[PDB]
Structure 1
């Protein structure tokens, strides 16, 4: 009706394209997704009104909590006999302060009781809010499990909480009525396993093949399961590019009933002997309804990515190019007088049971015919140790063919060491329906593994839907909202590897986004930021449509953020194309004049920070905004924090808006830094890092959190001697606090030395290392990582840094300060090595992004080198010291 049309305009504005463009899409998969996904929308809305208004408040303001209440011993020992000092504020008439000393693990209702006790000594109706931002303690966790409280304990800051009446929070949460949209109102058939025929596909002709007359041309093809070929590639005959017509049947060395569910056809047009791909494309051999492709098809192809010289691109995206003014290959598939469907699960289970029972009857001599057969008995405990050994290798370690036969033959024992599942899966003969059906039944009852281990099974090495479904069930059962937020970037990226629009992973992620608004906010922005990338914009736009339809009132707040970012994009675009040669003064006059237009001024003020939607951005402070000197001329922007107690957190929100460089690699490096820092703290290795906020919001457009009161090394030594840095630090921390500043500088140095060495970050210089007044050192600008150059040391500690560490001693390399510094590095390095699978998998999950430094598994191999995974641990230490000793010309 009329209200649906208004909502469609809002959704269209949020996602950057009109909803009517989805309505015109003819593809049945697209219209079925739009309709069928709505039961996730409904399920989520019903969880939110399950216990109103509390359930609604928990959705908008979910508890920001660590994944477990247990405190590292070094954190706990910062308390006074396990007790914490907190300040509770009450708004009365005027702000009244009440200081409490309570056990670190009282729940909020207890803290509120003690605050009222103290207040009445001055002679379930309240909640606690963090002073200065929109963060609440709505749930009965231990106080120290809230990240704000945990952070205060570690940083030695005083927690400041505000008492607030429940009803004054509930009052401001609009009830949203979710309405089902108008589109919600909507020869035989033979099993694949009965088709007794080999696979054959006809290449007819190519259109839109416009080239520089490049001469002889051919179509290369292959059948793939993930990246694994299921048979040899098959080429057409060569023809000249002026007449690209083949009409050639290609015969594949594979039996049709042996085609696995995720089988794909990968092809390309190649030039010729120097061969070179000109355009590529992949298609699912089964569609989303389990039907084998049939009839004729036109496939619009994709351009070759600069860097790839392979002739096929099977880890490239699957499906037709939306740009129809592109090389278009016409295909024809085999005809069978019948629709052919992948067999249902009951048929697969029957076949697996038949196979298992047959193999259990195999004689000794029969089992000897194949190393993939082993008799139940034979299993010795040395084979058991070898299985356990294999299960501890990292995801990029080669599994030899003999190892694969060995794993497959002992698949049933593997159930007792369930983390071996990823290696067992890469040992399956995916072109054998006998083996695959058995693997299906093993997966359906496989024991659960850790979410960090399950995430590997969603990357591009694991296309099978039963495998990915098991991975999703593991996340559903074990992944906390805290870790889902931590790994959300990767989980969004692996949506791109799903064969179909509707799948278990997207239903899981959408439901979490629609029941936790902190997850939903970044879900929205990660998807929105890629709506320019045409390999994913249909999938992501449809997903965003379904998010926007059910997220409730937050859609209106997102639209405030989208409009503000759009205005900043438009202004910076003008500056870089129409005024780029004018002086700063002139550009600044132009900028202030444009931001003072009333439509602009209103769009740029009074909205939530996309970096952290708990932070309200109030009125701009134009006198504090400025065009920075760095490359691409980013904007330094300053907003008032309108929170009634802003002075207790920060009174101004400073954000850098950068239009022109890709920020996705910085995003990923800052995420990894945070994970490393988390690993170190849990082990009681207190190395303070600074993973400041960074969010890509578009095509080379994004936001960066400003660390207030920090300076580059260069700013410092321009006010110079190699003692200037230490001298600056000592003057900032005179008295009894000098030692704490040296210690914080030493630990922060050790963390960044180790982190940047492991990741192969871009070379450090005195303009991309910064220091806070209190001694905390950190790095900025991570536009390069991994093997972008034989392993570099990006952070070489020059004399200035050693002088600080050694408290001003001339011979700083030969002090016990330096020795304890080295020990921190060694402990930090070995700690990350123990978690190498995590970091390898997090990188592998990002392979399908457009990030140029992260294109193949061999880019990730760099991490295998810096962590020395093929060495022993003591050999790994020795390797790290030599890299350090080489880079510094002595010391280590």
Structure 2
């Protein structure tokens, strides 16, 4: 195709059913009804017109740029929007239901691949999944249509609330004797001028009580009977709801007003809550009805594993398409291992070494494991390695589940297309990689053969396993201090064989301390039928644990389906929709570790995603952003299908987002590769020209922000849009806020669209920063951080929320003057804050600068973030300091680093312009903030380590193995006492600043 845009008029070749073909000149913008009608008016000039019916009996088909033979049922669509590979149309008679096909097209646009590609999949697991997961779709659709229209509004506009109503006393103390004042607004005229009604109310009033005080204040002089007032209250309670001014957030549920996140922030920031009084019928009006039509594809002797008396045995036959220099290396061989998660169940075994030019072994490999001892989650990890001291390295890897999704043991010959080795991985095998076969062509194909035991073999039912447990089991103070001691240690603590079998010995006394379950499970001999059978019984009746603990059991160290099932049941019962929406990035990544498409976790996530459109929004984008990765493209694809097929009318909005982003990447691709030989000034005059296009304007205007769909993006401010002066040249974008009362929130919605570098390192750090900020607030430390919005929407492409009224400290240094010889004046920053915080607010700006500065020192040190400099350190006009561009973390490349060094510029702000900054009382108070913040993270180090370990399979090179996470165990000094940790933190800070600590 290779055409950016069709000319205004083009020649399309139309293939008529009588055999003729007609070259029809037609407008680019022309719709198919226009094309089909004028075609059959042109067809009359060609032979064999008698054989043609009325155009009503035909539709067009063609081949898209995705190689899809698409039937253009939706004839309202525009020629230039069809994604045509070639400008031709084949007239045909329509067949099949029209709604399924027009819906599948818009689903394919959303998920990024034609849905028909799923129909042509051999794998039975793929066809069973998309069939069987439809039940989760219907039970979620039924659950939102029940109790309409309120239930539907709760799905599309769910309450944005904190996890608990109780205000931390730090926040309650800002209230005026436990009360907050709010201004409630009303649009009163057609011209849309507004009225104000200011109230003072208890912080824990529910929205309906706020409605009651508003109508009471308005009717104070009406002389209402006590009952006549209540009728007015009932009326306005049942007729109106409250909306946040400037954004699409509504208070539709009777939570205490102080736990709605918008208002708890107004209490935190001391701002003035602005709420619009809205007629709830006017809200239900903008919620069109949507339905879940069951798709078309929803239609249409064994023995036990525990009776095979033999050791495991697998045959390695040959390989193909192996790419290696026959003259540079010596030989190749196949390395194999039997794994249960990350732990090999038995010692590995290799084939014999063979010349590169003849990859052929035909070897039976014997493994030191008795088949009945195989755990259910057992899997074969293998690779093809080269050899040339003696040094090895892998050429291509591949993993296989010894049991399929039907509980059967693999048997017979099997071909396995291998995957490339991930960048920077020297390990010979890749057990944490996905089980599957590379769909790419000409990839090295390794052929194997599994034993056939005269019949299909199945894993024993749980009924038989508990029998064997009872059969195998038949064959105090200082101890309970050990159990409580080992429970305390972090997830990645060293547990010795002495501690393991001690835990396994007291496995029954462990139930009294349920959070010990991760340690105990790691002590089980998973390569023994006996121990596993007993552990299943403990898990069956294990006391539930809190979600932040169960999330550990979903990482790559716990593959057993009974452990994960227990973990998932902990989440669906204890994980609030708030903390689900906060950890969603990890819960989506641990889907990769799942052995099978159909599991309890994915069904859990999909359900909550289809019953809470807030988490369903990022549930879609985190999956869509990774659809380029072929290793997971199929799983995430089928999952996206199920979602987009039942999410409701929100699909129409998602497509406007996907289409808008698609034109930002197409445009930015042209500027970075087609028009690369030009500077900024000449690229700007080209940028605006493309943005002047109507089609571009119609697409990029009037849609929802992917960073937060509550923000509507109205018309563009072209004059404010630009291409930024950075190496990768991103786009600075500015929309108007079309809210009726945008003037009360923000009229400028500014986002940076960046295409070039990977953004999911920043999503994680920004997520991490938000976590540690939240626990600091809840522990009395008011260290305001700024986890701005960042979202990866594709392969090295995403969006970044820009902070209003902020500058880099470099930009600020340039506002001042020079002092030393060719040296900026250290006092420029302080003079800048003074200039913008004159008077009594000065003591506040320095307090906000000191507190935020303390939080970013601790956060950056713990995480080993890339070195800070004056162009990635920023400070608000407000005085708040924050960082940007969290490129690397955990010390990525080649000592205990300190990336954020307090130059003199910051100290002369903290010390309010003194000379002996390190000796002032103001600086000693800043140090007290850091120490408390650091120790506060140490006492929450478990959930931070679990968050990183759940991201190991993400593919981020900064962390590939559990060893990479050890950096955090070092900066937090988890193998030492709190006192040794405090002393350690001071040590590193002192060395970095050459004294003071």
TM tier relative to shorter chain: over 0.9
Q: What do the CA deviations read for 1:675-729 (whole angstroms, capped 9, x no partner)?
A: 0000100011110000000000000000000100000001111193111111100
Give the Cα–Cα distance (whole angstroms) in 2 for the partners of residues 703 and 353 of structure 1. Answer: 57
Q: Which residue of 2 aligns with 1:797?
A: 902
Give the Cα–Cα distance (whole angstroms) in 1 for the partners of residues 678 and 726 of structure 2. Answer: 16
Q: What do the CA deviations read for 1:400-442 (whole angstroms, capped 9, x no partner)?
A: 1111111111100011111010011110000111100111111
Q: What do the CA deviations read for 1:42-97 (whole angstroms, capped 9, x no partner)?
A: 11001101110000000000000000011111110001000001010011222111
SS at match of 2:219: helix
Q: What do the CA deviations read for 1:200-258 (whole angstroms, capped 9, x no partner)?
A: 00101111123211331111111110011111111111111101111110111111100
Give the Cα–Cα distance (whole angstroms) in 1 for the partners of residues 687 and 425 of structure 2. Answer: 42
Deviation, 1:393, is 0.6
Deviation, 1:850, is 1.3
Contact 2:423 2:957 in 1 (8 A): no
Q: What do the CA deviations read for 1:149-182 (whole angstroms, capped 9, x no partner)?
A: 0011101110000000110001111111110000
Q: Which residue of 2 aligns with 1:478?
A: 574
> For the structure 1 residues 796 and 321, does the alpha-carbon distance in structure 2 shift closer, same or farther, using more than 3 Å as the test?
same
Q: What do the CA deviations read for 1:496-550 (whole angstroms, capped 9, x no partner)?
A: 0000000000000000100000000000000000000111000000000000000
Contact 2:393 2:426 in 1 (8 A): yes
Contact 2:408 2:457 in 1 (8 A): yes
Give the Cα–Cα distance (whole angstroms) in 2 for the partners of residues 221 and 527 of structure 1. Answer: 31
Give the Cα–Cα distance (whole angstroms) in 2 for the partners of residues 122 and 65 of structure 1. Answer: 36
Q: What do the CA deviations read for 1:435-489 (whole angstroms, capped 9, x no partner)?
A: 0011111111110001000000000000101000000000011000000000000
> For the structure 1 residues 804 and 413, does the alpha-carbon distance in structure 2 shift closer, same or farther, using more than 3 Å as the test?
same
SS at match of 1:736: helix
SS at match of 2:333: strand
Q: Which residue of 2 aligns with 1:200?
A: 313
SS at match of 1:338: coil
Q: Which residue of 2 aligns with 1:120?
A: 219
Q: Which residue among 498, 504, 507 is the counterpart of 1:402?
A: 498
Contact 2:760 2:792 in 1 (8 A): yes
Q: Which residue of 2 aligns with 1:442?
A: 538
Deviation, 1:264, is 0.5
SS at match of 1:268: strand
Once structures 1 and 2 are overlaid, which stretch shifts more, 719-728 or 341-350?
719-728
Consecutive unaligned residues in structure 2, runs of 5 or more: 1-96, 223-237, 815-822
Q: Which residue of 2 aligns with 1:173?
A: 287
Once structures 1 and 2 are overlaid, which stretch shifts more, 33-42 or 302-311?
302-311
Contact 2:866 2:891 in 1 (8 A): no
Give the Cα–Cα distance (whole angstroms) in 2 for the partners of residues 882 and 61 of structure 1. Answer: 50
Give the Cα–Cα distance (whole angstroms) in 1 for the partners of residues 661 and 296 of structure 2. Answer: 31
Mapping 1:36-75, distance limit 5 Å = 36-75=132-171
Q: Which residue of 1 aligns with 2:943?
A: 838
Contact 2:159 2:253 in 1 (8 A): yes
Give the Cα–Cα distance (whole angstroms) in 1 for the partners of residues 330 and 441 of structure 2. Answer: 23
Q: What do the CA deviations read for 1:737-770 (whole angstroms, capped 9, x no partner)?
A: 1101010000000000000000000111110111
Normalising by structure 2, we get a TM-score of 0.87
Contact 2:332 2:385 in 1 (8 A): yes
SS at match of 1:97: strand
Once structures 1 and 2 are overlaid, which stretch shifts more, 715-724 or 88-97?
715-724
Contact 2:404 2:410 in 1 (8 A): yes
SS at match of 2:365: strand
How many equivalent pairs are there? 870
Consecutive unaligned residues in structure 1, runs of 5 or more: 359-379
SS at match of 1:497: coil
Give the Cα–Cα distance (whole angstroms) in 2 for the partners of residues 870 and 453 of structure 1. Answer: 20
Deviation, 1:118, is 1.8
Once structures 1 and 2 are overlaid, which stretch shifts more, 589-598 or 755-764?
589-598
Give the Cα–Cα distance (whole angstroms) in 2 for the partners of residues 251 and 174 of structure 1. Answer: 63
Deviation, 1:101, is 0.4
SS at match of 1:539: helix
Deviation, 1:585, is 2.3
Once structures 1 and 2 are overlaid, which stretch shifts more, 775-784 or 397-406?
397-406
Once structures 1 and 2 are overlaid, which stretch shifts more, 576-585 or 291-300?
576-585
Give the Cα–Cα distance (whole angstroms) in 2 for the partners of residues 183 and 357 of structure 1. Answer: 51
Q: What do the CA deviations read for 1:837-878 (whole angstroms, capped 9, x no partner)?
A: 010000000000111111111110000000011111111000
SS at match of 2:456: strand
Give the Cα–Cα distance (whole angstroms) in 2 for the partners of residues 383 and 720 of structure 1. Answer: 63
SS at match of 2:478: helix
Give the Cα–Cα distance (whole angstroms) in 2 for the partners of residues 545 and 329 of structure 1. Answer: 31
Give the Cα–Cα distance (whole angstroms) in 2 for the partners of residues 166 and 310 of structure 1. Answer: 60
Q: Which residue of 1 aligns with 2:37?
A: none
Give the Cα–Cα distance (whole angstroms) in 2 for the partners of residues 611 and 774 of structure 1. Answer: 23
Deviation, 1:383, is 1.2
Give the Cα–Cα distance (whole angstroms) in 2 for the partners of residues 538 and 452 of structure 1. Answer: 29
SS at match of 2:466: helix
Deviation, 1:354, is 2.1
Give the Cα–Cα distance (whole angstroms) in 2 for the partners of residues 717 and 172 of structure 1. Answer: 50
Q: What do the CA deviations read for 1:376-401 (whole angstroms, capped 9, x no partner)?
A: xxxx2111111111111111111111
Once structures 1 and 2 are overlaid, which stretch shifts more, 29-38 or 720-729?
720-729
Once structures 1 and 2 are overlaid, which stretch shifts more, 89-98 or 497-506?
89-98
Give the Cα–Cα distance (whole angstroms) in 2 for the partners of residues 74 and 269 of structure 1. Answer: 59
Q: Larger relative contact order (C-alpha < 8 A, sep ≥ 6)?
A: 1
Deviation, 1:122, is 6.9
Q: Which residue of 2 aligns with 1:291?
A: 408
Deviation, 1:583, is 2.5
Once structures 1 and 2 are overlaid, which stretch shifts more, 258-267 or 397-406?
397-406
Q: Which residue of 1 aligns with 2:194?
A: 95
Q: Which residue of 2 aligns with 1:371?
A: none
Give the Cα–Cα distance (whole angstroms) in 1 for the partners of residues 936 and 895 of structure 2. Answer: 23
Normalising by structure 1, we get a TM-score of 0.97
Q: Which residue of 2 aligns with 1:374?
A: none
> For the structure 1 residues 121 and 580, does the alpha-carbon distance in structure 2 shift closer, same or farther, using more than 3 Å as the test?
farther
Give the Cα–Cα distance (whole angstroms) in 1 for the partners of residues 331 and 965 of structure 2. Answer: 36
Once structures 1 and 2 are overlaid, which stretch shifts more, 686-695 or 624-633?
624-633
Mapping 1:776-815, distance limit 5 Å = 776-788=880-892, 789-815=894-920
Give the Cα–Cα distance (whole angstroms) in 2 for the partners of residues 799 and 174 of structure 1. Answer: 59
Q: Which residue of 2 aligns with 1:301?
A: 418
Give the Cα–Cα distance (whole angstroms) in 1 for the partners of residues 324 and 221 of structure 2. Answer: 86
Give the Cα–Cα distance (whole angstroms) in 1 for the partners of residues 262 and 100 of structure 2. Answer: 40
Contact 2:398 2:436 in 1 (8 A): yes
Deviation, 1:580, is 1.9
Q: What do the CA deviations read for 1:124-160 (whole angstroms, capped 9, x no partner)?
A: 2111000000000000000000000001110111000
Q: What do the CA deviations read for 1:10-58 (whole angstroms, capped 9, x no partner)?
A: 1000011000000111100000000000000011001101110000000
Contact 2:790 2:799 in 1 (8 A): yes
SS at match of 1:317: coil
The structure having more radius of gyration, on CA atoms, is: 2
Q: What do the CA deviations read for 1:266-288 (whole angstroms, capped 9, x no partner)?
A: 11111112122111111000000
Deviation, 1:119, is 2.3
Once structures 1 and 2 are overlaid, which stretch shifts more, 557-566 or 572-581?
572-581
Deviation, 1:652, is 1.2
Deviation, 1:351, is 1.2
Once structures 1 and 2 are overlaid, which stretch shifts more, 54-63 or 314-323?
314-323
Q: What do the CA deviations read for 1:343-371 (whole angstroms, capped 9, x no partner)?
A: 1111111111222234xxxxxxxxxxxxx
Contact 2:536 2:562 in 1 (8 A): yes
Once structures 1 and 2 are overlaid, which stretch shifts more, 789-798 or 280-289?
789-798
Q: Which residue among 933, 950, 953 is the counterpart of 1:848?
A: 953
Give the Cα–Cα distance (whole angstroms) in 2 for the partners of residues 887 and 733 of structure 1. Answer: 31
Q: What do the CA deviations read for 1:650-692 (whole angstroms, capped 9, x no partner)?
A: 0010000000010000110000000000010001111000000
SS at match of 2:840: coil
Give the Cα–Cα distance (whole angstroms) in 2 for the partners of residues 197 and 334 of structure 1. Answer: 10
Once structures 1 and 2 are overlaid, which stretch shifts more, 852-861 or 348-357?
348-357
Mapping 1:730-809, distance limit 5 Å = 730-788=834-892, 789-809=894-914
Once structures 1 and 2 are overlaid, which stretch shifts more, 588-597 or 515-524?
588-597
Mapping 1:251-330, distance limit 5 Å = 251-272=366-387, 273-330=390-447
